[PDB]
Amino acid sequence: APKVIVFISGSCLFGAISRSLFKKLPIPYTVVLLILGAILGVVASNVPLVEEHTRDVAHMDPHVLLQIFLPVLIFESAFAMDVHTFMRSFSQVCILALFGLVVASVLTAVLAMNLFNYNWNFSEAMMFGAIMSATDPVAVVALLKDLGASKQLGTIIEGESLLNDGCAIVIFNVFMKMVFFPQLTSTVGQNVLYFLQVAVAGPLWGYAVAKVTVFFLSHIFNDALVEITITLAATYLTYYIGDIWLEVSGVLAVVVLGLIVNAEKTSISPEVEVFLHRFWEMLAYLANTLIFMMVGVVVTQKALVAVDKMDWFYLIILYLAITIIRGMVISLFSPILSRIGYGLTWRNAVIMTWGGLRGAVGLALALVVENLAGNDVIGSKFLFHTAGIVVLTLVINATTIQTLLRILGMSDISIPKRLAMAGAVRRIHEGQNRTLNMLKSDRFLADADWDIATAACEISDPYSSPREFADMMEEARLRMLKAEKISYWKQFEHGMLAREALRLLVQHAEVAADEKDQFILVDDLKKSWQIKGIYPWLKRKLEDLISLMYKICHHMAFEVTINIAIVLNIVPIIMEFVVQDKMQKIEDALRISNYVFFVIYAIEAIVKILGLGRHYIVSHWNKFDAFILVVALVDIIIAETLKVVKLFRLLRGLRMLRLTKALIPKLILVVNGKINNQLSLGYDVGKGYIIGEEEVGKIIDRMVDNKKILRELKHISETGRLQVVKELGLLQREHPGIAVSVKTRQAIRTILNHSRETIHELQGAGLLDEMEAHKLELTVEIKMKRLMNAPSSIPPPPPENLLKNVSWLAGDMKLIDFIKARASLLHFDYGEVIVREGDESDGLFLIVSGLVKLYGKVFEDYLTVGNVIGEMGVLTKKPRNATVTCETTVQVYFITAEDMNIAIDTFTLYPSLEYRLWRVVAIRIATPLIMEQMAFQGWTQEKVKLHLERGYLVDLAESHFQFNIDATLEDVILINGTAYNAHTREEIRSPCLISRTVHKLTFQYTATEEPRLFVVRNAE
């Protein structure tokens, strides 16, 4: 019967009681956990039956304590952090945590040597400083996350805490091995090698196991428990193998592994993501509870038996000096911290000074000092001072950080947030009153008690002249910015934006609102999609790096065969190196003449592919293959003459060139993936700003009342939208394959999201049960996770594949053959004119490469690859509306008007080419009208487009050129021509939306009119 089970369960129950009883009180639950542990240790010192149950956990080994509790705490601190804002302010976090921890450890060591009466040397004092300077604030970061603004302050406190804890355990391990467990001597070179080993191979081993774990998690579908156990086993194996087998600081390895796993959360399924968040929070909570209970028991059993009044005096002075030292560290790093991103205000410096809550990490390190010291008093003094500092920091700093956050003015609720919460409470109260008025008129719920129902449903407020022209301009700018923020949140909620693009767009909107008269700036938004860096240069240089018998060897198999030769050469390289370093059957005849010249070098690379002259001349890879062959023949005649330098030259040269030639395209794929991530973020930010400008241009007529202010706001919005559109087109031009890959991924994601919504609508309507809909949801989730492992660079389709993928051409095959037979690829250079504004209609222009500019007269737009120009001019036989000028080198497919008229006249099935072309231009001409009608109703662009997609053009000859508008038709849009309405009360000249007062339509049949009508109905 293990007593540790009883102690662990009792600690869990004590922690649950402590959190359930001290939630309302401002003091933390860990302090009363320490108090309960002290009481339990007093009882164990009195009663031996309790001593038998507390002995196995109180007198635990230091090594198993570290190896069990440290990976959980370090990995949860790394996993809980928002890694985007952590990497955004990584410079400040890194310099503050690293250099402040170093100088705080030095100052605390000097204080421990000068103030304390014990004759401590520098090693034990530096151990004391490394234990004292490790900070674990969780209440402070929870308070900063909950109380409104300064989210950057919360994440800089969290990142500083994580790196401070990691490097503090590193410094503590260095000095613990300096003073306690060995006392060995070494040279300066071994010290340099040990510093290199720790500080470099910590994060390198963590990065290696993190990439292996990410590759393992990215290839697991429809299995959650495997992913959870892989995360847990990867954390524990990383820490154990790094700390024990590799003699490497495993704390930094778990820091790096947790930060990378938190960075690559898209390789984990979202249900597994939220389970992993809750699971690691639970594991760290259990670890903190066990550490604090164990610390209390051992403090009142062993660390309190040698304590005098001078120890308490030194504890008080140590607390005051620790707070002063941390404040002076932040104050002396304030110029350098202000000179880099986000700066540091004096209020944030005061919060970071006072938010240094000591935690379970320093308690565990003092525990292993106390257990490692043995019967010496240094461990008892260490654990007493650490327990006192933890208690004092927790109590005093928690209560005073609540009242200090109140006093400094960083906890005041903003006026727009308070007004939004008041509006939410008002709409909830209105909805509850309507629900109660519905419920009182029920049959079954008619004699229920309504006083109790109203008292239960009482959710309440948690927060309890040119000068006129300037004021109206400020009001209009503020209303426009609020509408832009609302539009960005609407885009994110509808499954269009990512989280990072949403955060960047609302950050730009807020910092535009804080200034005097500026709007959201395009130039500040350019840095999102500025893909320039070392990665385009790396991709360019690597694509410059790689650029009879031949027909035998082109079957992509002999390179795989020589890669098998690469690994089968690499293994005896290490074997011969190790055995000849440590120096049977003369190395078994030297691996039987290294596999008999390695099957005479795979029959001399199949006799240099039987002597391909040009291929072996023009390639340098074959040149150092020939260098390998002459070097290996030289080593063969060296073995005939028999040095080891020649053998090692053979091994080294073989392995290095073979691995370089293999690893070049994988490096190309990695660079393409990083460019893909940057391009996805930039495209999401740009597209979100564009559709936000479209929505804020739609809804601006209700808000803005003046005319000059509305004109200036429209001009500013149009200039910003045009600049972002041209920038995104040029960015697509710079990296074509990456842009095709990110557009393909976004298209697949949108299609699968709409399919998931269709499955939800099927299961909510009762036509599909829970099990079959869960099977279909599992199928679409497997497809989404395999979409996350897409190729990062899909090669761009040829112009024929773009010609067969047009919306009005895609279904048919004979029509595709006709268009491909009668198209014409025309090339244009920079600055030339494709068409002119006053010219007659001549044909369509499918853009297959490059960017154009439509200077319609004002009307400006930039079209890219995959846009057809001139459908309306071809169909309606009107003259051209816009002049198209090239912005880059543009290749277009020009189908002439005669060929398109012939193709329209021939193909007359039920989906006809005339019907498809008119439906495409009807969607294009009816989307802004429906957007104008339902602008204030909150309908987005994509919902309007998908609502319009269910519509269809009516055949007026089927209904004798008269159309009735019932309530069965959701919306009716006239596309071309004139019309008359109702009892011929007026004439409908416009292509605008039909008003709801029209009950009937009448069309005549004139020359050059051909009237069309696009109707959308509800679910019939």
Side-chain angles (χ1 to χ4, degrees), residues 56 145 157 209 234 248 291 344 519 605 640 656 723-724 773:
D56 297 305
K145 283 165 56 186
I157 279 189
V209 188
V248 150
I291 282 177
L344 254 208
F519 291 88
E640 158 259 315
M656 72 178 181
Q723 189 166 341
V724 172

PDB file of all heavy atoms in Angstrom, residues 56 145 157 209 234 248 291 344 519 605 640 656 723-724 773:
ATOM      1  N   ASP A  56       7.041   9.581   2.848  1.00  0.00           N
ATOM      2  CA  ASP A  56       7.412   9.185   1.494  1.00  0.00           C
ATOM      3  C   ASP A  56       7.436  10.365   0.535  1.00  0.00           C
ATOM      4  O   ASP A  56       8.103  10.304  -0.501  1.00  0.00           O
ATOM      5  CB  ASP A  56       6.451   8.109   0.994  1.00  0.00           C
ATOM      6  CG  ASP A  56       6.529   6.836   1.814  1.00  0.00           C
ATOM      7  OD1 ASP A  56       7.642   6.289   1.957  1.00  0.00           O
ATOM      8  OD2 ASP A  56       5.484   6.390   2.330  1.00  0.00           O
ATOM      9  N   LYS A 145      -4.798  40.357 -17.615  1.00  0.00           N
ATOM     10  CA  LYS A 145      -5.600  39.902 -18.745  1.00  0.00           C
ATOM     11  C   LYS A 145      -7.073  40.237 -18.554  1.00  0.00           C
ATOM     12  O   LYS A 145      -7.758  40.607 -19.514  1.00  0.00           O
ATOM     13  CB  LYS A 145      -5.420  38.399 -18.949  1.00  0.00           C
ATOM     14  CG  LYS A 145      -4.113  38.010 -19.621  1.00  0.00           C
ATOM     15  CD  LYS A 145      -3.830  36.525 -19.458  1.00  0.00           C
ATOM     16  CE  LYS A 145      -4.972  35.677 -19.996  1.00  0.00           C
ATOM     17  NZ  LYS A 145      -4.778  34.230 -19.707  1.00  0.00           N
ATOM     18  N   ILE A 157       5.056  40.402 -18.866  1.00  0.00           N
ATOM     19  CA  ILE A 157       5.257  39.811 -17.544  1.00  0.00           C
ATOM     20  C   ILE A 157       5.323  38.292 -17.643  1.00  0.00           C
ATOM     21  O   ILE A 157       6.199  37.659 -17.041  1.00  0.00           O
ATOM     22  CB  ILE A 157       4.156  40.288 -16.576  1.00  0.00           C
ATOM     23  CG1 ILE A 157       4.498  41.682 -16.048  1.00  0.00           C
ATOM     24  CG2 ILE A 157       3.946  39.309 -15.423  1.00  0.00           C
ATOM     25  CD1 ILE A 157       3.606  42.165 -14.923  1.00  0.00           C
ATOM     26  N   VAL A 209      13.544  18.189 -30.901  1.00  0.00           N
ATOM     27  CA  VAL A 209      12.420  17.367 -30.454  1.00  0.00           C
ATOM     28  C   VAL A 209      11.094  18.078 -30.708  1.00  0.00           C
ATOM     29  O   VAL A 209      10.078  17.426 -30.964  1.00  0.00           O
ATOM     30  CB  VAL A 209      12.602  16.967 -28.978  1.00  0.00           C
ATOM     31  CG1 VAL A 209      11.557  15.959 -28.545  1.00  0.00           C
ATOM     32  CG2 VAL A 209      13.958  16.349 -28.787  1.00  0.00           C
ATOM     33  N   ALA A 234       6.515  13.528 -25.082  1.00  0.00           N
ATOM     34  CA  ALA A 234       7.551  14.354 -25.685  1.00  0.00           C
ATOM     35  C   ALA A 234       8.128  15.333 -24.679  1.00  0.00           C
ATOM     36  O   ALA A 234       9.346  15.530 -24.644  1.00  0.00           O
ATOM     37  CB  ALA A 234       6.992  15.098 -26.894  1.00  0.00           C
ATOM     38  N   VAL A 248      22.712  18.233 -20.656  1.00  0.00           N
ATOM     39  CA  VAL A 248      22.248  19.465 -21.273  1.00  0.00           C
ATOM     40  C   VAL A 248      21.174  20.061 -20.372  1.00  0.00           C
ATOM     41  O   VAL A 248      20.465  19.329 -19.676  1.00  0.00           O
ATOM     42  CB  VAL A 248      21.752  19.117 -22.700  1.00  0.00           C
ATOM     43  CG1 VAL A 248      20.644  20.013 -23.205  1.00  0.00           C
ATOM     44  CG2 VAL A 248      22.918  19.123 -23.666  1.00  0.00           C
ATOM     45  N   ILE A 291       3.845  20.750  -4.568  1.00  0.00           N
ATOM     46  CA  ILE A 291       5.061  21.454  -4.173  1.00  0.00           C
ATOM     47  C   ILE A 291       4.823  22.298  -2.927  1.00  0.00           C
ATOM     48  O   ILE A 291       5.626  22.265  -1.989  1.00  0.00           O
ATOM     49  CB  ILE A 291       5.592  22.296  -5.350  1.00  0.00           C
ATOM     50  CG1 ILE A 291       6.309  21.397  -6.355  1.00  0.00           C
ATOM     51  CG2 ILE A 291       6.545  23.379  -4.879  1.00  0.00           C
ATOM     52  CD1 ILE A 291       6.801  22.126  -7.580  1.00  0.00           C
ATOM     53  N   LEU A 344       8.477  51.238 -22.026  1.00  0.00           N
ATOM     54  CA  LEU A 344       8.003  50.940 -20.678  1.00  0.00           C
ATOM     55  C   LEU A 344       7.648  52.255 -20.011  1.00  0.00           C
ATOM     56  O   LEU A 344       8.535  53.076 -19.759  1.00  0.00           O
ATOM     57  CB  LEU A 344       9.055  50.196 -19.857  1.00  0.00           C
ATOM     58  CG  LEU A 344       8.871  48.700 -19.591  1.00  0.00           C
ATOM     59  CD1 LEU A 344       9.559  48.314 -18.291  1.00  0.00           C
ATOM     60  CD2 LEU A 344       7.406  48.293 -19.560  1.00  0.00           C
ATOM     61  N   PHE A 519      -6.608  58.416 -40.121  1.00  0.00           N
ATOM     62  CA  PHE A 519      -7.398  57.207 -40.255  1.00  0.00           C
ATOM     63  C   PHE A 519      -6.462  56.007 -40.174  1.00  0.00           C
ATOM     64  O   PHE A 519      -5.287  56.138 -39.825  1.00  0.00           O
ATOM     65  CB  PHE A 519      -8.193  57.238 -41.556  1.00  0.00           C
ATOM     66  CG  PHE A 519      -9.281  58.265 -41.571  1.00  0.00           C
ATOM     67  CD1 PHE A 519      -9.023  59.565 -41.978  1.00  0.00           C
ATOM     68  CD2 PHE A 519     -10.564  57.934 -41.175  1.00  0.00           C
ATOM     69  CE1 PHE A 519     -10.022  60.512 -41.987  1.00  0.00           C
ATOM     70  CE2 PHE A 519     -11.570  58.876 -41.186  1.00  0.00           C
ATOM     71  CZ  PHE A 519     -11.298  60.167 -41.593  1.00  0.00           C
ATOM     72  N   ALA A 605      28.476   4.034 -60.321  1.00  0.00           N
ATOM     73  CA  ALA A 605      27.246   4.776 -60.616  1.00  0.00           C
ATOM     74  C   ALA A 605      26.670   4.343 -61.963  1.00  0.00           C
ATOM     75  O   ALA A 605      26.347   5.164 -62.832  1.00  0.00           O
ATOM     76  CB  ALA A 605      27.462   6.292 -60.556  1.00  0.00           C
ATOM     77  N   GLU A 640      46.351  -0.988 -50.179  1.00  0.00           N
ATOM     78  CA  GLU A 640      47.307  -1.885 -50.821  1.00  0.00           C
ATOM     79  C   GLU A 640      48.718  -1.658 -50.291  1.00  0.00           C
ATOM     80  O   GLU A 640      49.433  -2.620 -49.980  1.00  0.00           O
ATOM     81  CB  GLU A 640      47.256  -1.689 -52.337  1.00  0.00           C
ATOM     82  CG  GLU A 640      48.501  -2.137 -53.089  1.00  0.00           C
ATOM     83  CD  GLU A 640      49.412  -0.980 -53.456  1.00  0.00           C
ATOM     84  OE1 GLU A 640      48.901   0.048 -53.944  1.00  0.00           O
ATOM     85  OE2 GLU A 640      50.638  -1.096 -53.247  1.00  0.00           O
ATOM     86  N   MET A 656      29.477  14.501 -46.378  1.00  0.00           N
ATOM     87  CA  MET A 656      29.088  15.907 -46.456  1.00  0.00           C
ATOM     88  C   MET A 656      28.485  16.244 -47.818  1.00  0.00           C
ATOM     89  O   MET A 656      27.442  16.912 -47.878  1.00  0.00           O
ATOM     90  CB  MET A 656      30.268  16.829 -46.098  1.00  0.00           C
ATOM     91  CG  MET A 656      31.420  16.964 -47.096  1.00  0.00           C
ATOM     92  SD  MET A 656      32.692  18.118 -46.552  1.00  0.00           S
ATOM     93  CE  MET A 656      33.821  18.045 -47.941  1.00  0.00           C
ATOM     94  N   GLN A 723      -4.831  51.382 -53.081  1.00  0.00           N
ATOM     95  CA  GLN A 723      -3.435  51.107 -52.765  1.00  0.00           C
ATOM     96  C   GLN A 723      -3.244  49.684 -52.256  1.00  0.00           C
ATOM     97  O   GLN A 723      -2.298  49.002 -52.667  1.00  0.00           O
ATOM     98  CB  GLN A 723      -2.930  52.118 -51.742  1.00  0.00           C
ATOM     99  CG  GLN A 723      -1.442  52.070 -51.506  1.00  0.00           C
ATOM    100  CD  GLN A 723      -0.949  53.288 -50.757  1.00  0.00           C
ATOM    101  OE1 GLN A 723      -1.624  54.316 -50.711  1.00  0.00           O
ATOM    102  NE2 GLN A 723       0.232  53.181 -50.162  1.00  0.00           N
ATOM    103  N   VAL A 724      -4.154  49.203 -51.402  1.00  0.00           N
ATOM    104  CA  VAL A 724      -4.022  47.844 -50.872  1.00  0.00           C
ATOM    105  C   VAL A 724      -4.250  46.803 -51.967  1.00  0.00           C
ATOM    106  O   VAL A 724      -3.549  45.782 -52.020  1.00  0.00           O
ATOM    107  CB  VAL A 724      -4.967  47.651 -49.670  1.00  0.00           C
ATOM    108  CG1 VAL A 724      -5.004  46.207 -49.206  1.00  0.00           C
ATOM    109  CG2 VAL A 724      -4.507  48.512 -48.525  1.00  0.00           C
ATOM    110  N   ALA A 773     -24.351  12.562 -38.886  1.00  0.00           N
ATOM    111  CA  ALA A 773     -23.776  13.897 -38.955  1.00  0.00           C
ATOM    112  C   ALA A 773     -22.426  13.961 -38.261  1.00  0.00           C
ATOM    113  O   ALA A 773     -21.554  14.717 -38.692  1.00  0.00           O
ATOM    114  CB  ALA A 773     -24.730  14.921 -38.351  1.00  0.00           C
TER     115      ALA A 773
END
